Amino acid sequence: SPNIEACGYSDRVLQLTLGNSTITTQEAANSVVAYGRWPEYLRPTEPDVAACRFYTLDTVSWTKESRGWWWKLPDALRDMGLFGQNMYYHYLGRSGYTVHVQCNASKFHQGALGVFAVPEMCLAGDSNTTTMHTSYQNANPGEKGGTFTGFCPVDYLLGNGTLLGNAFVFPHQIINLRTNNCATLVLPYVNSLSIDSMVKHNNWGIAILPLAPLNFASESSPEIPITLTIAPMCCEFNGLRNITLP
């Protein structure tokens, strides 16, 4: 689905400075808009560049035994400065995400990391007569993130009873080491409602699985790292409530 061939190595370093944050992207080109829709404003209180700056989650290590990783939005970003506050200080909140997953390795490492963004990704519990199941905390790992396995999501079933070989129906890009180091995903606000209760309902699910295994030349770095940088796009909330100071 994501059959692209930018250049191969590196050309230009174009840095994305949004407010206080500053990422230096591999380039910037090769970006996939989810369903071809940009995050707009509800057609409220708009905290702009204050609540629209790059927060970077924990960098997880990809090793020969790694089965994968998965996060939840907004959830992950609930412990990030301003956006975190605006999440716990409102009853309403709609905000998009520019998930920019960067992965650096040498011209001696091989593998394929596919980033699948699943809308409303409920995780493993063939309990139709009852989803949610796994407690709020077991369902919300936050910034640290949860992991797939061969609170138990089965990787080949994308952790939801649907073969990963079909996962490609969701918006996604394959970071294939020999190609791009970067992967760009802009997910617009998708929900059954106009605006919603961010603390309860999880709008998105970034899941990074390993398509090809990692193989480093003879002896090198036993493991490489993958970084997730996310940023709230066109964020609005209604309406403050007793700046409930902690």
Binding site: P44, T45, E46, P47, N238, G239, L240, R241
Partner: protein, 56 residues
């Protein structure tokens, strides 16, 4: 009605005249009580005069 955006406030003044500086302090209040007398008696204490230094 029930609205919480983050504007400035909501509307413009709604009349505040009696809260103005001039009308805040425009109320006389006791400041002291000076006691005198006319003693035929030599009461060199109250002895007619009573002096008070003007202090709020």
């Amino acid at each position: 009605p029930s609205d919480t955006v983050q504007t400035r406030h909501v509307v413009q003044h709604r009349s505040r005249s009696e809260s103005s500086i001039e009308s805040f302090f425009a109320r006389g209040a006791c400041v002291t009580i000076m006691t005198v007398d006319n003693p035929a008696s030599t009461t060199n204490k109250d002895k007619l005069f009573a002096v008070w230094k003007i202090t709020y």
